[PDB]
Amino acid sequence: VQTVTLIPGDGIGPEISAAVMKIFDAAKAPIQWEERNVTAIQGWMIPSEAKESMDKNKMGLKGPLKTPPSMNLLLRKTFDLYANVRPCVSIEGYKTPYTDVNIVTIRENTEGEYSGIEHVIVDGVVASIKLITEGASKRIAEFAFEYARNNHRSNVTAVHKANIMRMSDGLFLQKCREVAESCKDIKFNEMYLDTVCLNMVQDPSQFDVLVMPNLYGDILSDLCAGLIGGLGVTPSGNIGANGVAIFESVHGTAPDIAGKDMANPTALLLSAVMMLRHMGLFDHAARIEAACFATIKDGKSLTKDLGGNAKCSDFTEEICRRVKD
Amino acid sequence: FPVTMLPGDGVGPELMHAVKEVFKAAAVPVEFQEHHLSEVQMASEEKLEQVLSSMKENKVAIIGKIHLASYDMRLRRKLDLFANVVHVKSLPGYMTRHNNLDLVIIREQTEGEYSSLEHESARGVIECLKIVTRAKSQRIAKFAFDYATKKGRGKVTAVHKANIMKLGDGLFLQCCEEVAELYPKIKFETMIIDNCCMQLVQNPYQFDVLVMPNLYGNIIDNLAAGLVGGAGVVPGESYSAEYAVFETGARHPFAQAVGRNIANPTAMLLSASNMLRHLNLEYHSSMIADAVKKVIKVGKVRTSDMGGYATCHDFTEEICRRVKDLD
Ligand SMILES: Nc1ncnc2c1ncn2[C@@H]1O[C@H](COP(=O)(O)OP(=O)(O)O)[C@@H](O)[C@H]1O
Ligand SMILES: [Mg+2]
């Protein structure tokens, strides 16, 4: 029996956290929850009991947070969350114009145009500082190639703009190329960001694992989520230092429907599935994931946002009786 | 009517060949004067001046992709082509997952990350400067709103990442928010590039005109082009206060296809048609565009990118015989 740090969050957060809790218990998952609140205090940092919890449990599940220093930039520095993994998978029986999408975006989470560094050079002239380093690049590329080796993926594509930003993106590319030479069992290729965006929208099936710097990853992960149904069905995990990883929903707090038993908890649940696989609980992950997809394929009980009108409770309840197989 | 031509990189020369052939068959009173900037060696600043000089005389160009800052950024500063407009429009017979789509993408093209401002700050740590200025953000915002005023458009959307680049992208938004107040009959919305890219895939019909800085324009140009058929069919144009140069919307050399008579010239042809509109040869403009559009709708002759088997030359001549069938 193992303990997970749970940050319910704001708006629908509690509801969808509780929904994931009930599904885990129904599935007899060996998971207990330590509920924690990360609204920042200053001395800016997260509350001591949050950090102490996460340092001890390593696994965290995090719902949508409200935007005020952002608590997610704080979480990232506090645990050196350097790898943002976002699998994008077609949901069998939730029709979009795109089918058989199976892409994993690996996004460098520490650097790039997200440095926080800008200057007013002279009045009316701003320079924003994009930062690319040798170590961060090698680290993310080593992560994308380990992920491909451990998840049956065959191809890693490095997405870049080294033709426009010759030195920074060039360095990112060079460190990908090095790691790729070190991993002969994964086929590696390079591709410009604009070209990826041009092709992704036409034929998404030509892409497997994609590793890229921060800004490109933040943008392309959300583009790809459009192909399969939006942020309400997309999981996300962030890996960090000292075996810490935080799995998260990346949709908004949805206050227009908070508390009205109307929320869609697929995302947090599919993230909690990533979490379960990260912990070795492969059998519970596959049953919960199977129970989830089967509920959606059946159609008879979808939440408002996916073209139905079942309550969040009814959707959560059908999954629970399904996962008892 | 003299017109500066720059064949450009990759399949560029092949595409100009198709423009040149269709123009002959439509008896377009246009005389191209050819110059070369793409892939030159010290002969750099010289060739750029010959373009500016012929541009002062012709004030209108049609160019392929053009392969210290890059040759493209240098040309665009030398000519002050701050504004780039891509018309994202479905072709009635050419079916995709998003038909009946009509968007305009306006991108600032002289600053941002395209400045080549990079340096090694320490062993293995590279710094790269994205530039945003008040003067260029204001100017591209006025252009977008004058565009949407002129062409009868309703909404202008400013795309940004000011939640992260609060100073630089913030100053871009600020100039947009200022200009928007002068055009009260135009709706003004803002949206983070992250979401905007998801929005364009789920439901691009929610948009109308979009305006944005350089890098986000390169992304959205390509994304939106792929919605309506890809780089073979989507045209573009770049403006100064006195110049207009026409090009393709999602700019790519297509190195693979050079010499294989494979490339689709629809984008370059439609662009040439908009060029003719800019020259007050409306009759020739609407004829070429109507012929291009009808050969695609009918479905007999179509290049690989559009589901067919035809060569670039086969497709071009099908256009030529159709235009000659109108005069
Ligand atoms: N004129 C054209 N006709 C048809 N397809 C085109 C044309 N230009 C570009 N494309 C499509 O767009 C892609 C452009 O990307 P490409 O030229 O390979 O360069 P990059 O190195 O920028 O990715 C091509 O692979 C091709 O599929
Ligand atoms: Mg994002």
Over chain B, what HEC string results?
CEEEEECCCCCHHHHHHHHHHHHHHHCCCCEEEECCCCCCCCCHHHHHHHHHHHHHHHCEEEECCCCCCCHHHHHHHHCCCCEEEEEEECCCCCCCCCCCCEEEEEEECCCEHHHCCEEEEECCEEEEEEEEEHHHHHHHHHHHHHHHHHCCCCEEEEEECCCCCCCHHHHHHHHHHHHHHCCCCCEEEEEEHHHHHHHHHHCHHHCCEEEECHHHHHHHHHHHHHHCCCCCCCEEEEECCCCEEEEECCCCCCHHHCCCCCCCCHHHHHHHHHHHHHCCCHHHHHHHHHHHHHHHHHCCCCCHHHCCCCCHHHHHHHHHHHHHCCC
Question: Which two structure tokens, joined as six digits, stand for A221?
Answer: 């992960």
Spatial separation of the C-alpha atoms in residues A35 and A20, rounded to whole Å: 13
> What 8-state DSSP symbol labels residue A310?
B
Q: Which residues of B touch A159 (CB under 8 A)?
A: none
Q: In a 3-state reduction of DSSP, which class is residue A189?
A: strand
Residue whose pair of structure tokens reads 């020739």 in the numeric block: B284
Out of A165, A194, A201, closest to residue B113 by CB: A165
CB A291 within 8 A of CB A272: no
Using an 8 Å CB-CB cutoff, list chain A residues near B225.
198
> What's the token pair of residue B311?
């060569």
Residues with CB under 5 A from ligand 2 (ion): A 218, 222; B 194
Q: Is A201 on the interface with B (CB under 8 A)?
A: yes
3-state DSSP call for residue A35? strand
Q: Which of residues 203-232 of A touch B (CB under 8 A)?
A: 215, 218-220, 222-223, 225-227, 230-231
In 3D, which of B218, B207, B197 has the Cα closest to residue A88?
B197
Instruction: Report the distance separating Cα A211 and Cα A160, nearest Å.
Output: 9
Judged by DSSP in three states, A294 sits in: helix
Q: How many CA atoms lie within 13 A of A58 on its CB side?
A: 11
Contact A128 B134 (CB under 8 A): no
Domain boundaries, chain B: 1-327
Give the resolution value in Å: 2.7
Interchain proximity A132–B131, CB inside 8 Å: no
The rounded distance, in Å, linking the Cα atoms of A109 and A76 is: 8
The torsion angles phi and psi of A186, rounded to 5 degrees, stand at: -110, 125
Decide: helix, strand or coil at residue A241: coil
Write out the binding residues of A for Mg(2+): 194, 218, 222
Q: How far apart are CA B208 and CA B213, in angstroms?
A: 17
- Which residue's alpha carbon is at the smallest distance from atom 22 of ligand 1? B252
- How far, in Å, from the CA of A216 to the mean position of ligand 2? 10
Cβ–Cβ gap A198/B250 under 8 Å: yes
Amino acid at A136: A
Identify residue A202 by its one-letter amino acid code: Q
**How many residues in total does chain B contain?**
327
Strand order in the sheet with A118-122: A118-122, A125-133, B125-133, B118-122
CA count, 13 A, side-chain hemisphere, A244: 21
Mutation to test the B interface, candidates A223, A236, A250, A306, most B Cβ within 10 Å: A223
Q: Buried b / exposed e across A300-311, counting CB within 10 Å, b at 16+?
A: ebbbebbeeebe
**Spatial CB neighbours of B233, under 8 Å, sequence gap ≥ 6:** B91, B94, B225, B264, B266, B267, B270, B305, B306
Paired sense of beta strands A245-249 and A59-62, if any: parallel
Query: Measured between CB atoms, does A168 come within 8 Å of chain B?
Result: yes
Q: Is B311 on the interface with A (CB under 8 A)?
A: no
Chain Cα centroid distance, residue B289: 17
* Residue ID of nearest Cα to ligand 1 atom 9: B231
A222/B223 touch (CB, cutoff 8 Å), yes or no: no
Largest CA distance in chain A: 67
Extract the tokens encoding A86.
Answer: 């976002």
Q: 3-class DSSP state for residue A60?
A: strand
Closest CA to B104 of B239, B251, B209, B219: B209
Q: Which residues pair with B102 in a beta bridge?
A: B89
By what technique were these coordinates determined? X-ray
The candidate with the shortest Cα–Cα distance to B311, out of B274, B268, B270, B263, is B263
Give the separation between CA A57 and CA A313, rounded to whole angstroms. Answer: 29
Residue whose structure tokens are 């009108």: A309
Nearest to A99 by CA among B97, B308, B198: B97
CB B61 within 8 A of CB B262: no
Compare all CA atoms of chain A with the CA of B225 and give the residue at the minimum distance.
Answer: A198
Q: Report how far apart, in Å, the C-alpha atoms of B33 and of each of B49, B51, B244, B271 are.
A: 15, 10, 15, 17
Contacts of B98 (CB under 8 A, 6+ apart): A97, B90, B204, B227, B228
Cα nearest neighbour of B192 on chain A: A219
Pocket test residue of B221, B252, B264 for ligand 1, highest count of atoms within 8 A of CB = B252
Instruction: State whether B197 and A132 contact (CB < 8 Å).
Output: no
Tokens encoding A191: 């591709």
Q: Is the dihedral of CA A283, A289, A290, A295 positive or negative?
A: positive
Provide the angle, in degrees to the nearest 10, between the axes of the packed helices A134-150 and A168-181: 40
- Residue A324: CB atoms within 10 A of its CB come to 10
Q: Domain map of chain A by residue range?
A: 1-325
| B254 ligand 1 Cβ < 6 A | yes
What are residue B88's phi and psi, to 5 degrees? -95, 105
Rg (CA), chain A: 20
What is the enclosing helix (H) or strand (E) of A197?
Answer: helix A193-200
Residue B230 beta carbon below 6 angstroms from any ligand 1 atom: yes
Residues of chain A with C-beta less than 8 angstroms from the C-beta of B97? 97-98
Cα gap A102→A100, rounded to integer Å: 6
